[PDB]
Amino acid sequence: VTLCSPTEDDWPGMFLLAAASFTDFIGPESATAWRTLVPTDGAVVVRDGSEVVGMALYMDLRLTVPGEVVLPTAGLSFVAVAPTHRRRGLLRAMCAELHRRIADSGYPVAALHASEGGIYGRFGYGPATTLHELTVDRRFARFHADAPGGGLGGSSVRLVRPTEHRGEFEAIYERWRQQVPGGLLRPQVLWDELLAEAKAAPGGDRESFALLHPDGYALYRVDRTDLKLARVSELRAVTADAHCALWRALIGLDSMERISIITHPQDPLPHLLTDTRLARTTWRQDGLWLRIMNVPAALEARGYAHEVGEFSTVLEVSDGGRFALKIGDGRARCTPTDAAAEIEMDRDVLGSLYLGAHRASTLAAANRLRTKDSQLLRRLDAAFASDVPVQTAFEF
Amino acid sequence: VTLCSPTEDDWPGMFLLAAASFTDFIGPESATAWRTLVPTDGAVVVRDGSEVVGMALYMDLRLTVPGEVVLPTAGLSFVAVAPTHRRRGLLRAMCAELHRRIADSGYPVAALHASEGGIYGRFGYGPATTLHELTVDRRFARFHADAPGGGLGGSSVRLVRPTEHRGEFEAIYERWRQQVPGGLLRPQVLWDELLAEAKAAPGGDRESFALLHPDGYALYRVDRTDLKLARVSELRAVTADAHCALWRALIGLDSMERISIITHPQDPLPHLLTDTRLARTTWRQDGLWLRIMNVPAALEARGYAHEVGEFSTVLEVSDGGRFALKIGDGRARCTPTDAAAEIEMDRDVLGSLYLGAHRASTLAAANRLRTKDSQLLRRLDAAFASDVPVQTAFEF
Amino acid sequence: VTLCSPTEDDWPGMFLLAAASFTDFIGPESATAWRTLVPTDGAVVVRDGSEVVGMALYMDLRLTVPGEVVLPTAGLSFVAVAPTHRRRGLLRAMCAELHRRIADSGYPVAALHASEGGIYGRFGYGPATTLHELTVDRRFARFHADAPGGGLGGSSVRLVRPTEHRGEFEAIYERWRQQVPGGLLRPQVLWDELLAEAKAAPGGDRESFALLHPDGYALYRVDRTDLKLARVSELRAVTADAHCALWRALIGLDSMERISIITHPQDPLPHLLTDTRLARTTWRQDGLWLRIMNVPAALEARGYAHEVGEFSTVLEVSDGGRFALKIGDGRARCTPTDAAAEIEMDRDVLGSLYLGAHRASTLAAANRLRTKDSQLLRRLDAAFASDVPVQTAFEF
Amino acid sequence: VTLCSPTEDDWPGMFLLAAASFTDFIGPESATAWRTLVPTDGAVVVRDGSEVVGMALYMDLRLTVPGEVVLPTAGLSFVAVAPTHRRRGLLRAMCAELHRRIADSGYPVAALHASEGGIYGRFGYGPATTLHELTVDRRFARFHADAPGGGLGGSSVRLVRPTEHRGEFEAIYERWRQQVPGGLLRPQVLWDELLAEAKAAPGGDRESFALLHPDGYALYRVDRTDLKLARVSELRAVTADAHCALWRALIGLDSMERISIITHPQDPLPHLLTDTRLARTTWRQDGLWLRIMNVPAALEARGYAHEVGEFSTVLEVSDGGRFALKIGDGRARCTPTDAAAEIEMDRDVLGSLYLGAHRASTLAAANRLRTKDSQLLRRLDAAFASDVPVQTAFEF
Ligand SMILES: CC(C)(COP(=O)(O)OP(=O)(O)OC[C@H]1O[C@@H](n2cnc3c(N)ncnc32)[C@H](O)[C@@H]1OP(=O)(O)O)[C@@H](O)C(=O)NCCC(=O)NCCS
Ligand SMILES: CC(C)(COP(=O)(O)OP(=O)(O)OC[C@H]1O[C@@H](n2cnc3c(N)ncnc32)[C@H](O)[C@@H]1OP(=O)(O)O)[C@@H](O)C(=O)NCCC(=O)NCCS
Ligand SMILES: CC(C)(COP(=O)(O)OP(=O)(O)OC[C@H]1O[C@@H](n2cnc3c(N)ncnc32)[C@H](O)[C@@H]1OP(=O)(O)O)[C@@H](O)C(=O)NCCC(=O)NCCS
Ligand SMILES: CC(C)(COP(=O)(O)OP(=O)(O)OC[C@H]1O[C@@H](n2cnc3c(N)ncnc32)[C@H](O)[C@@H]1OP(=O)(O)O)[C@@H](O)C(=O)NCCC(=O)NCCS
Ligand SMILES: Cc1ccc(C(=O)C[n+]2ccn3cccc3c2-c2ccc(F)cc2)cc1
Ligand SMILES: Cc1ccc(C(=O)C[n+]2ccn3cccc3c2-c2ccc(F)cc2)cc1
Ligand SMILES: Cc1ccc(C(=O)C[n+]2ccn3cccc3c2-c2ccc(F)cc2)cc1
Ligand SMILES: Cc1ccc(C(=O)C[n+]2ccn3cccc3c2-c2ccc(F)cc2)cc1
Ligand SMILES: [Cl-]
Ligand SMILES: [Cl-]
Ligand SMILES: [Cl-]
Ligand SMILES: [Cl-]
């Protein structure tokens, strides 16, 4: 049982492992496309000797954090241990090697999407975005008098074929991702992949359509088994007008009973309607998970809320150093110190705070971060909060 | 069709209407208990002439708002229009008369629980607390190393019969309600009612048990049809230790597969476990709705976040006046003015902001509050936020 | 945390624990009836100091084993640990004390019904009877030409009220239990309890009826929610004629679509019909679990199959001694020895073999009993098998 | 309405009938492969005159029976009567002609799989193997300390593509089928067919994977609609080590909640786990049905249990002769006699006894075999039992 970077000859074994480990497996053609995001030395495999019985890798991503700052980010993915080699320390060994390479390469953060919520905390990852499914019974849906885009004229939204307006989607998404915490750059190959999924498949998913506004788009399709359900796979809007107009069009799908979307907890949709309850929350789950690789680089790179007044504290991360943390004027300074700690937390907890999705007060109530000063808790809550609500870009 | 305060002779007709209008109807014995909370002139009825075809009333309540301030509150309830007299203006007439009496009596706010989410906005009520159902599959539940109350000794929690520890529940609840926004005083008659429901009913609900800690309690029962589901009807905890200890005991119910509770969005339970996902959000809905009766009294009575620096603005409520609003040092001053408005919103929107459950930014994104200054939005968001998370006390 | 025999004052605390631990809890009236089967010193409780946080007990039973031999048997029941005191060693301590008392009192075996199948193996109990649910769609059911009781005359079976024929049921059951491995003596109090359950309950179970034959009876009722399903709670027959006649009557319930029964794997019912498939096995589970307390007394008391020729071996029970085992003429001799073992197994495995429900070959294939001689396996299989098929009497 | 052997021109009509009669119909390409197992004169068709309105055939198979003896066996299949020609005596005529040809060709037994359980008894077929579906919730599955293949080193099992290891599967299966009662030789064309089904189908079944051990294999795939269910289509193991190791690998499929398999009643899997209940029996049904064509050849060819001592009896088969049956030293002699019968049974009953899956005692209790000597029943039970448990090879 050796651990090393795969050669070209290892990839068929890796795809075999992948097909057996991941039900949503993408097939070799698209796997080869995603592979273009894996840097040299971004992958590890474990061979039995010999066949491949373990693999893991990371992709080079760009993540937006509060203050519209974009960070290089290592996106862990394609992680798998053969069913024949469980409980043998392979995951711990693969993760440790990848984390070493990630740290040494200069990434301040790593990130992933969790197949199960209980595997990742122990490797320093905390859930940092929250996914909310809303299902709207559109038969009862009426817009509020206050809602935009219901004056007296033409509509700004068009129903179009996705593949014919790639450039407009790209441009809209690029603007979105640069101003929203959780935003990710979507490279060319992933647009290739996205638009390929837009076509109908024999005995599979149905054709996808798009609603296009100058400042937003929605991609959707009818559910394959429930023909009265439309699933919005992606809705991206830069203005409130674009967001309302797109939802006016979606609610105008008179063949459907229900419209569903995976969105975020601060989606304004429910307040667009006269009956807020019509937008039922049918599902709630963690989205992006974050491991802060370098505490001072990550804390200093992020912008903070201007409303809170300047304050200073000392933060210990359990096996990640102790720092003097000074926050004021929306910026932070984070320097080494051996002074007594005022706040302690494990490294994963810091990831959960980092994009503003969880409150320090709430984590304190679970004793996941310790302090003997509630004024400091209030200050951290306020400082780490995000003006623009945190969202989840796309799964990887 | 006349409108007036009911006499003693009207109550049987009112109970008839109630039995036909409300499936969860409580029967005459308990209705007579709840009636002790209705002040003189707190009820209206509409007679056909003659029988009672419409009714509405309010109860005298005490509501805790941020800053641990307790306000007299008119709790609307028992509202019903006969199926034979729909679409005849009865509700609008009954609500207008009750609101007049409520305003003239000196209540700064009114409140209610909504049978449907689309009836109430037009009468000035906005949803102000959010209910979250969590369902935990307790077979996989493991507590985090960091979680309190897992040292090495005895347990502080006891399993007891509710009716034998009334005084300890009362005292714990009283402490809870005074420090939590959304807290309501629970008078003696409602404790009588609560403990009566704790007994098993033939072909109805099962016996209720309690878990009692010096600083908290949980009341629960096995679901009547799903015998592997325990439903926590009420969990009230004053310290984080009490909250964790109670959940350790609940997860020790080894006969059950699932534990469910109606709680709030900031419940720390998910962070107590090693796998946060095990606490599934199975339901989400509006709780308490608020109508601000007197804007300056309500805005001045509430405490505000100290973290935000002093600022001044002008707020127009659509048919509720225009005010110079100055907020600093956690307090607000709110005085009449005819200066140009910087923020406009309908009255229900203000209720939704009032206990800190919804962000002004989010309501702005739906154009439910208008302003041309995003710095002001950030300031309102921060000022109106609640240090202690907002919760829902009990249904009325 | 002390461990001792309960006093009269402890029983209310015990019933409180029971009501919270067991959903099928029987109420204090019937609990007091079952208590008459608990000998002096047959119960233990664990107090916190003080309230009762753990309990366990055994009942004095009489179990029939192959060869129609009746053994004194300690039937463990009413075992519970408070949810507040889990993972504290209470069960292990209560079980050890009860087992000591059981052994010292002279019981050769103990027995129980398992709330969960994974708790009991480690205390020396193995599953020894198998429960099979059959559901017959009686609309298609036709009896084979060969089946008894379809000649040309009157019927021998009568439809009767259970409470009016107690004596005939008692006598039939007594004959049954003495000739069937797994049979248990049913004392007077348990007949009192059984016939009380036969009456309808408001918002509960429906009235029970009986089909009575001189050599058998069936007790049944319509399912409370599925009104096309009749549930046979108990069918006891001494002759094949009685068994067939009772099933002819059950299939004549023309209001029902389905008849279901919890029976055993060798129930001949499927072979009574022209279409064997109509008797669907809808459920399968372990019934009685056995812990052999005294290996030589238990092995010597049981009868063995005459068909296998005399043989001798050496059996080690993992922490239960090593014995020279000689079997011939349907009897066994089992004496101490230090000669090398030919067969090893844990104590629970021996319980699983003891009533003939599991084959030694099958347990060997799972390596739950070790030997390096397959001829010996064949010999054990044959010797331990039961002429009369093993059945499960009643739950306790 | 004539009955005769089909010509080449009849086969399209036969495939038309097949497509309309069998939902699981295999298509013409694979039907032509299975056709290579049909001997000359192994098929009959009924023409209306003219189109084909009835068909039936048999295939040349090799069946293993207790004592590891392999018998030529006529496997009935592809039997169908047009919906337009029901209740016209076609089946009875086709079966009688095929049975004549089968008998005259020298087959001692015929066999089939039943589309419905009530059609076949009257033509002399009795169910002779039992299929058991086990569904394991693998999230709770833990192996017993006693279970093999959990030492401290590498794994002997590999995850592989089925099509790349055909030869190893063939060799393992060949060993299996020769030592297990119910085993069938699988010719080349059926391996061609099996491996073709291993590939994914568009809007059909998913890709199949294999777990390969030197002495066993498992073939499995994720269920097409329930993506948390893995279905083991075939598991074949020659040693207990191979069987345990394969199940260790299957339970290591961490993406799945449940693993299911169609197996036999003596599968040791449940005893491999600490909680035997985790292996739920979700389905139970008859497998292979047998018609004994020649009673003395079949009874003399089979091996019998050595443990029972020599005995002699007289057996009448209802329309199949009367024989002096002498059994001793694991062999039987079966000769003609006119002496009085001690045991009578229909021919189908004998098929049900023949592979040891049903006990003579059980069939006697249903009066499906008559005798006035219970000692003889015990002797038959013991003699006809199979050392190696009876299994079902593959459907045909
Ligand atoms: C990798 C895998 C299938 C199991 O791997 P493994 O080689 O058996 O794990 P290792 O022995 O290397 O060590 C993993 C540690 O986490 C624990 N662990 C691993 N998988 C687990 C699971 N599914 N549930 C709970 N705990 C788990 C182990 O107990 C071990 O810690 P411990 O020895 O201190 O108890 C499993 O963890 C899995 O489901 N995938 C993990 C996914 C992941 O981490 N990242 C990918 C998301 S893109
Ligand atoms: C009261 C009731 C059953 C219907 O009453 P009604 O006498 O028909 O209503 P009125 O004619 O007095 O006027 C009510 C106004 O709200 C609207 N409205 C009333 N009930 C409605 C409902 N269930 N859904 C949508 N709109 C409704 C009416 O259209 C009317 O406004 P409009 O005439 O401008 O359109 C109904 O509103 C109901 O479900 N209960 C209301 C509950 C409530 O408001 N408070 C109690 C919670 S404790
Ligand atoms: C008794 C009870 C609720 C838990 O008791 P407890 O006091 O936490 O158990 P203890 O700490 O005394 O020790 C029990 C041992 O079995 C294990 N165990 C106990 N309950 C278990 C369960 N529900 N599942 C799996 N393992 C369990 C423990 O891990 C411990 O062994 P370990 O420390 O070596 O791992 C639980 O076992 C239960 O469900 N009832 C047991 C029923 C029984 O044994 N007999 C009654 C049938 S009538
Ligand atoms: C063949 C078929 C569809 C009906 O055939 P048919 O020509 O109507 O039957 P016949 O008239 O030739 O005679 C069949 C006898 O069995 C009975 N029978 C036939 N199909 C039956 C069914 N589905 N259910 C119950 N009884 C049936 C008939 O009543 C008749 O006996 P009877 O006249 O003494 O009552 C039907 O039996 C069927 O489902 N397939 C039979 C499958 C089979 O036997 N072997 C193939 C398994 S690979
Ligand atoms: C080399 C390579 C790298 C990644 C991939 C991908 O296909 C990643 N990817 C993308 C989008 N997705 C949506 C749902 C699931 C995914 C997967 C994925 C796959 C495996 C994981 F562990 C986590 C995520 C394929 C090949
Ligand atoms: C005079 C009088 C006043 C109120 C009542 C009550 O029973 C109020 N109450 C209390 C608790 N609840 C829980 C669920 C539903 C309730 C009801 C209730 C009843 C009617 C409503 F329109 C709204 C709420 C009964 C009588
Ligand atoms: C003192 C006393 C002793 C036993 C009991 C009984 O009621 C036992 N009993 C009987 C029949 N049953 C059918 C289903 C469940 C039962 C229970 C039972 C109760 C608890 C157990 F742990 C196991 C079984 C009640 C009181
Ligand atoms: C000439 C010819 C002979 C047989 C066949 C086959 O396809 C047999 N066969 C094989 C496997 N199977 C699994 C499920 C159902 C089957 C069928 C089958 C088909 C018809 C039956 F009456 C019984 C079985 C096809 C053509
Ligand atoms: Cl970005
Ligand atoms: Cl209050
Ligand atoms: Cl007995
Ligand atoms: Cl064979």
Swiss-Prot record, chains A, B, C, D:
Q: Which protein are we looking at?
A: N-acetyltransferase Eis
One of its GO biological process terms is:
symbiont-mediated perturbation of host innate immune response
Question: What do mutants without this gene show?
Answer: No significant difference in terms of intracellular survival in U-397 macrophages and in an in vivo mouse aerosol model of infection. A strain lacking this gene induces more TNF-alpha but less IL-10 production in primary human monocytes than wild-type. Macrophages infected with a M.tuberculosis eis-deletion mutant display markedly increased accumulation of massive autophagic vacuoles and formation of autophagosomes in vitro and in vivo.
One GO CC annotation: bacterial extracellular vesicle
What biological function has been recorded for the protein in this entry? Effector that is released into the host cell and affects host immune responses; it negatively modulates inflammation, macrophage autophagy, and cell death through redox-dependent signaling. Acts as an acetyltransferase. Acetylates 'Lys-55' of dual-specificity protein phosphatase 16 (DUSP16)/mitogen-activated protein kinase phosphatase-7 (MKP-7), a JNK-specific phosphatase; this leads to the inhibition of JNK-dependent autophagy, phagosome maturation, and ROS (reactive oxygen species) generation for enhanced intracellular survival of M.tuberculosis.
Any coiled-coil regions, as ranges: none
* Cellular location(s): Secreted; Host cytoplasmic vesicle, Host phagosome; Extracellular vesicle, Bacterial extracellular vesicle; Host extracellular space
GO molecular function, a single term:
N-acetyltransferase activity
- Species this protein is from: Mycobacterium tuberculosis (strain ATCC 25618 / H37Rv)
Q: What class of enzyme is it?
A: transferase
User: Pfam families, from UniProt?
Assistant: Acetyltransf_17, Acetyltransf_9, SCP2_2
Additional free-text comment from the UniProt record:
Increased expression of eis due to point mutations in the promoter region of eis is responsible for resistance to the second-line injectable drug kanamycin in a number of M.tuberculosis clinical isolates, through acetylation of its amino groups, which leads to inactivation of the drug.
| Active-site residue numbers | 120 (proton donor), 396 (proton acceptor)
Activity control note: Is potently inhibited by several small-molecules that share an isothiazole S,S-dioxide heterocyclic core. Some of these inhibitors, when used in combination with KAN against resistant M.tuberculosis, efficiently overcome Eis-mediated KAN resistance by restoring the antibacterial activity of KAN. Some of these compounds also inhibit in vitro acetylation of DNA-binding protein HupB.
- Identify its protein family: Belongs to the acetyltransferase Eis family.
Keywords from UniProt, A to Z, are: Acyltransferase, Antibiotic resistance, Host cytoplasmic vesicle, Secreted, Transferase
What EC number(s) has UniProt assigned to this enzyme? 2.3.1.-
Q: Which residues form the N-acetyltransferase domain?
A: 1-148
